[PDB]
């Protein structure tokens, strides 16, 4: 069964496909698996409460008696033929669930640091496939591999001190001089032969073999079927985490960086990955600000310690003199005013940095939308200047029209 969630959204167990007992068995393994692998991913003002909440089967999904509720952890996971995918709530609409997939991967393209191509994703737009995050990241792995295997096969050179019936390469002399004449019929050479089954090819044969076994599309089954035939002579391996560390990216296999990072993102039971929606917006806004703020340079994660260090998500300073704090919040900001938890942190970030502070918030049809300019000016009775900026999201499309509107509102703010 395929189940899909948006951030802070619920599904009924009666309407859902499959079995009632089957889905709740899949989740308790996933929330437990998120507990052991929680510390690998960074957060930003998450209020995670690592001791109590995550180990109570509330790590990724809150499984309840009457419904199934998603926390603010975005991504996907495939467990026990119950494929779960959690999209952001910002891309929620009012092919009907194919626009938020390419919106989320493009927000996973710019924020998280991936180097995927837009024409890789635009190939899938309109082919009426079943929307699934695991079916597209296997495709993004398989297409970027088959576009990097079609040119060259990555045959890397190792040297072997082999006793050959012929003579290839440099003849070892200290091993041939001390050769008895009863065994003179084989040369003892040290040939730098190119092997096809290197460590990077043992991984990509194993990463395809664990992908074709767990794929469900009709496009990925054809593409991984051609990749497995190209890797036919390679002896297979069992994938571990030691194999993904033992290879290093030099200049002769640098073009295999794009399929390998996606092969490390999906393989290392469980499959997939999860990230916090607060930090992914904190990373995504950081791409927008430094591009859109020419007058003043901006650094993310600068920290100033009170008295326990409370650090802003981003601060922009021209040289050192202007202190314009920019704290990225994923909150909906209901009733056109910041909440108690938000404005209390905005007060501290301005005071310990005469410092204006701007809060960027999400804006679409689903999320709360303010007017086009800088919506809310606030003073906290200390000559402060709190500006509520809102970035519109044309990221569901491929054109960046809202970046010009975000620059025009920031130019009036700067």
């Amino acid at each position: 069964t395929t189940i899909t969630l948006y951030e802070h959204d619920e599904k009924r167990y009666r309407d859902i496909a499959g079995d009632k007992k089957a889905i709740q068995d899949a989740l308790i393994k996933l929330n437990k698996q998120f507990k052991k692998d929680f510390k690998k991913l960074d957060r930003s003002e998450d209020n995670s409460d690592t001791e109590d909440t995550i180990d109570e089967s509330k790590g990724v999904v809150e499984v309840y008696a009457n419904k199934i509720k998603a926390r603010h952890y975005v991504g996907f996971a495939a467990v026990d033929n119950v494929f779960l995918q959690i999209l952001p709530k910002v891309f929620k609409p009012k092919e009907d669930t194919w626009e938020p997939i390419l919106a989320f991967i493009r927000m996973l393209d710019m924020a998280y640091g991936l180097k995927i191509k837009d024409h890789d994703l635009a190939y899938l737009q309109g082919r009426n496939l079943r929307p699934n995050l695991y079916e597209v990241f296997i495709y993004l792995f398989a297409k970027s591999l088959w576009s990097e295997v079609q040119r060259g096969y990555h045959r890397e050179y190792v040297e072997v001190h082999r006793e050959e019936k012929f003579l290839r390469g440099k003849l070892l002399m200290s091993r041939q001089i001390r050769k008895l004449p009863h065994q003179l019929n084989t040369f003892s050479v040290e040939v730098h032969e190119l092997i096809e089954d290197n460590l990077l090819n043992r991984i990509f044969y194993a990463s395809v073999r664990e992908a074709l076994r767990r794929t469900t599309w009709g496009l990925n089954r054809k593409l991984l079927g051609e990749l497995m035939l190209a890797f036919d002579g390679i002896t297979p391996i069992h994938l571990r985490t030691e194999h993904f560390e033992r290879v290093h990216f030099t200049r002769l296999n640098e073009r295999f960086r794009r399929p390998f990072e996606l092969a490390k993102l999906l393989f290392m039971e469980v499959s997939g990955f999860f990230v916090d929606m607060n930090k992914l917006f904190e990373r995504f806004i950081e791409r927008v600000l430094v591009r859109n703020l020419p007058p003043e340079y901006k650094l993310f994660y600068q920290e100033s310690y009170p008295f326990s260090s409370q650090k802003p998500d981003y601060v922009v300073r021209k040289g050192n003199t202007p202190v314009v704090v920019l704290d990225a919040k994923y909150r909906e900001l209901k009733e056109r005013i910041p909440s108690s938890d938000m404005l209390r942190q905005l007060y501290v970030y301005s005071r310990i940095w005469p410092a204006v502070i701007v809060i960027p918030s999400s804006s679409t049809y689903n999320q709360g939308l303010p007017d086009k300019p800088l919506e809310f000016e606030f003073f906290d009775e200390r000559k402060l200047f709190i500006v509520a900026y809102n970035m519109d999201y044309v990221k569901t499309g491929a054109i960046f029209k809202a970046d010009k509107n975000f620059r025009r509102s920031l130019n009036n703010i700067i």
């Binding site: 437990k32 507990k35 052991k36 692998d37 069992h238």
Partner: protein, 113 residues
Amino acid sequence: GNDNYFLKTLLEKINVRITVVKDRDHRIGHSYFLNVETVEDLHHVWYYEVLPLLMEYFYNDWETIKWVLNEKGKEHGNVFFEKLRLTGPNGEEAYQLKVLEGDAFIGALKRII
């Protein structure tokens, strides 16, 4: 237990649970049980010649071998892999095999049928 069809249905209830969690080419053969004469000989065959194969085919995976023996959820008893009490740094199951003997071993082999 006066069952003439016992060792036939022992490998059949193992192999049809082997071929659905692994390949068909990873099954347990029938040359190991062709020399059983007493229960102590079957105790040696099941612990030094068959269960080493199941630990070899299922490495770092203690749940699927617990379903091949259809003893899932049952630990710390007459179980061929008892659960270790310890959890680990992040939390692993990490079972350990248990050498049974006597009628207790047959009481653990009867429920594989």
